[PDB]
Amino acid sequence: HNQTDRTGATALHLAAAYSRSDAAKRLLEASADANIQDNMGRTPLHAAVSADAQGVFQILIRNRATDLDARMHDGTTPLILAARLAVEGMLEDLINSHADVNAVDDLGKSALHWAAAVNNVDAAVVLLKNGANKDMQNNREETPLFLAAREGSYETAKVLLDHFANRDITDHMDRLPRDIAQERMHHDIVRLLDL
Amino acid sequence: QTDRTGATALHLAAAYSRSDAAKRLLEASADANIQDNMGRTPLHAAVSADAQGVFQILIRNRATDLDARMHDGTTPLILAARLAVEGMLEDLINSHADVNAVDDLGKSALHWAAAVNNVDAAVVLLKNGANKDMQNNREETPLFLAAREGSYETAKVLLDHFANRDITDHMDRLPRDIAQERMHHDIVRLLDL
């Protein structure tokens, strides 16, 4: 019931991963724990996001006891995961359900850092519109703009610059976003930063 | 809905303990917090009907406002306190309802429990951080209200919680004075202990 398999997956994890809406509801009605962590610290909500299981995702976010800010064993939250995976809708649904927009994983990266690293531009816009700290530094003193520049995420770097993200905040080695873009040969980003 | 009393389908599911209906409406994105003519949401109606199945469905639904106010400021917790329904007041508290919210007369759920001598609710409320000394608009503490209404069991609870017996109403009456006035002999002697 709250019994797990070899991967630490409960029945509720499996419903998430397999898109079993009804099984998910019966489990939750029977007081099944919504926040049990599997071997990687994923709760069923992490699993619903990874599986892009829209039905179970909606059931889990509607359930008041679900921890929308639950952390995997590397501090990854459902919001960071949705940002990284670029699944449709879930990112904005979590935000509208009051997930913490500025929570960070264990390396100090927020959902916006990750939207920038993977060039998930729609996620960055939604995050920025809902109070994401555009100039947040992670443990390595990297801002989302720094990561965009490093990864060649032109479209997301442009959204951040249009939101007046601070282009002079350097990383732990004193590198500007312009510097890391130049080192990594992202000439288009260098040009964008020079405008 | 809404209908003639201002009841949506979800109010009616609450009033008649229809759990299947309530679940179906919520999963179809019905607004959990529509007020009827008296300012009741489906959650107030479930408390009033003592509808345990629908009550549980509603409180497990994230978007339900557990602290919703009727037109006199009555919250679900206050209503559960007044009515002395089983289970519901504790479940609201455990779901993080505001223990210290007040109706428009400034009465908290603890004020009400004292007034109706709902001693179990007083114990639960005090255990979860209720202000034992909170004064309402008329400057009445829950101890004062227990004293006035002859609520021995609840006045004992609040005294055991070191409620301040010296706090007076707007006419500067002690709980001891009002018990004396209303000839609640058990309370006066309770208070002289």
Asked if A94 reaches chain B (Cβ–Cβ under 8 Å), the answer is no
Asked if B10 reaches chain A (Cβ–Cβ under 8 Å), the answer is no
Residue A63 backbone phi and psi in degrees, to 5:
-85, 115
Inter-chain CB proximity A64 and B26 less than 8 Å: no
Query: Are the beta carbons of B123 and B157 closer than 8 angstroms?
Result: yes
Experimental method: X-ray
Please give the structure tokens belonging to residue A182: 């130049």
The dihedral of CA B181, B187, B189, B190: what is its sign?
negative
Query: Are the beta carbons of B18 and B26 closer than 8 angstroms?
Result: no
Please give the structure tokens belonging to residue B18: 């229809």
Inter-chain CB proximity B61 and A65 less than 8 Å: no
How far is CA B7 from each of CA A27, B16, B59, B73, B174, rounded to the nearest angstrom?
Answer: 31, 12, 19, 19, 43
Least CA distance to A58: which residue of chain B? B27
Residue B140 CA, chain-centre distance (Å), reads 16
Asked if A35 reaches chain B (Cβ–Cβ under 8 Å), the answer is no
Query: Are the beta carbons of B52 and B87 closer than 8 angstroms?
Result: yes
Domain that holds residue A35: 1-195
Q: Beta-carbon neighbour count of residue A106 at 10 Å?
A: 12
Resolution, Å (one decimal):
1.9
CA distance A60 to A65: 9
Inter-chain CB proximity A62 and B63 less than 8 Å: yes
The CATH number given to whatever domain includes residue A193 is: 1.25.40.20
**Tally of residues, chain B:** 193
Could you tell me which of B122, B193, B187, B104 has the C-alpha nearest to residue B161? Answer: B122
Query: Are the beta carbons of A78 and A60 closer than 8 angstroms?
Result: no
How far is CA A119 from each of CA A51, A100, A114, rounded to the nearest angstrom?
Answer: 20, 21, 8
Inter-chain CB proximity B59 and A64 less than 8 Å: yes
Inter-chain CB proximity A61 and B61 less than 8 Å: no
Asked if B105 reaches chain A (Cβ–Cβ under 8 Å), the answer is no
In a 13 Å sphere around the CA of B174, the CA atoms on its Cβ side amount to: 11
Asked if A61 reaches chain B (Cβ–Cβ under 8 Å), the answer is yes
Long-range CB pairs of A131-135 (<8 Å, 24+ gap) are A131/A101, A131/A102, A132/A101, A132/A102, A133/A102, A134/A160, A134/A163, A134/A164, A134/A165, A134/A166, A135/A165, A135/A166, A135/A169
Inter-chain CB proximity B61 and A66 less than 8 Å: no
Could you tell me which of A73, A66, A77 has the C-alpha nearest to residue A114? Answer: A77
Could you tell me which of B26, B30, B56 has the C-alpha nearest to residue B43? Answer: B56
Peptide bond into B2 cis (omega under 30): yes
Asked if A63 reaches chain B (Cβ–Cβ under 8 Å), the answer is yes
Least CA distance to A25: which residue of chain B? B23
In a 13 Å sphere around the CA of B100, the CA atoms on its Cβ side amount to: 9
Could you tell me which of B179, B118, B172 has the C-alpha nearest to residue B148? Answer: B179
- Overall domain count for chain B: 1
Chain B residue numbers touching A25 (CB-CB < 8 A): 23
CA distance B154 to B145: 10
Helices H / strands E in chain A, number of each: 12, 0
CA distance B47 to A118: 49
Question: What is residue B61's three-state secondary structure?
Answer: strand
